[PDB]
Amino acid sequence: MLKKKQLTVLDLHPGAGKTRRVLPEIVREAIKKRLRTVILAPTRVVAAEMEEALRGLPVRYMTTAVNVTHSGTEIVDLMCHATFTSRLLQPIRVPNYNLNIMDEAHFTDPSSIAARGYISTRVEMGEAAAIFMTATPPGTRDAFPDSNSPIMDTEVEVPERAWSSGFDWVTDHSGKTVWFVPSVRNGNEIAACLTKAGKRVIQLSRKTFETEFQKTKNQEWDFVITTDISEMGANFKADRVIDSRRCLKPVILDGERVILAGPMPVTHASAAQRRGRIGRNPNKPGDEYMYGGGCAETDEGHAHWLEARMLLDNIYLQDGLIASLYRPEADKVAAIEGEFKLRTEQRKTFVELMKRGDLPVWLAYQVASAGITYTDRRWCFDGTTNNTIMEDSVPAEVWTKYGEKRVLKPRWMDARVCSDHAALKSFKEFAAGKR
């Protein structure tokens, strides 16, 4: 696999050992061949597991989630997928890695898709080798793949709201359950219902993931309510997965706004990754997978693929060339390569709006391509009346950096900046000039 001009897809089923057994063997051989290597982790939780499995080996951890001594002579770097794309974007020298190992190479976040594109172009150009590790490579149509122990699969009506009757099977279970909901707001409602019935619930989402995941190991729990974030290597000591089979999809309507369409069916890869949380211990057969709907290829027309093209168009590769998206997923977006390329100053603003401002890729591009500087928040208030953001059924209000009380009405409307209470809180701080 380590030979140049080769992209290997390590499509071993969930729980085969692609991090504890396979990853250390690859690292040993790369170190032996003097190959400059990058290991890409989907999350900081997965990067911490990798440190444990690669202990002793000379690896430079470019993550604060690891507290180890660095010798200074390490030719293998380890960082998250977003950290990799971020460094490609910033005016920082990134080594020309000979070997590129991406773990959970199915991750659909804009920065993961952009890293797959950039790396796969280098491999296609004959400049490097790559190993994409995932049980569900792009294109998979199997929602029920092989597992370490048998799984009982049940098509059942899964609740998406609080319930009084009709779902005795949910609460009459003794084991621990991982329940995949389509959104934070939907998880809050089910969690309240379970808590009221006497259950201990932990809630996981992209923002609370590193902090809350530790509670799954430090305290007794009956249920873990999670969004699609737990599809990227989250390991649980559970015996049941309840899968609504639904998700929200960010969609660009008319090219002027982003809405959160759905809930709608998850792809076959998401259903297999969600089911993949259980059936992992061959000494405990009979884990349950209760699923509440079917699968469809809903990644077509999803904003993340357009956003990945916005990132790649602003990453230098070779003079006037631009990295293509990884071939099995290049059709999920109708885009022109280079159409999102920004000039040096607008590109710096774009990067700062995503990195410091914490705005979604699409929103940062709208603002940066309009000639607006990072600290100028006038656009958060000069939009049309239908762009008014609502909180508690009343227009959301902030005090501007000028000390004036205004209604939040952004020039560009992205549903993700007000999807939950936490998102709107951070966006109110942004519009106020707080970061």
Ligand SMILES: O=C(O)[C@H]1CCC[C@H]1c1ccsc1
């Ligand atoms: O994390 C992602 O994938 C997206 C979501 C918004 C920020 C963006 C990003 C981060 C690193 S490079 C581009």
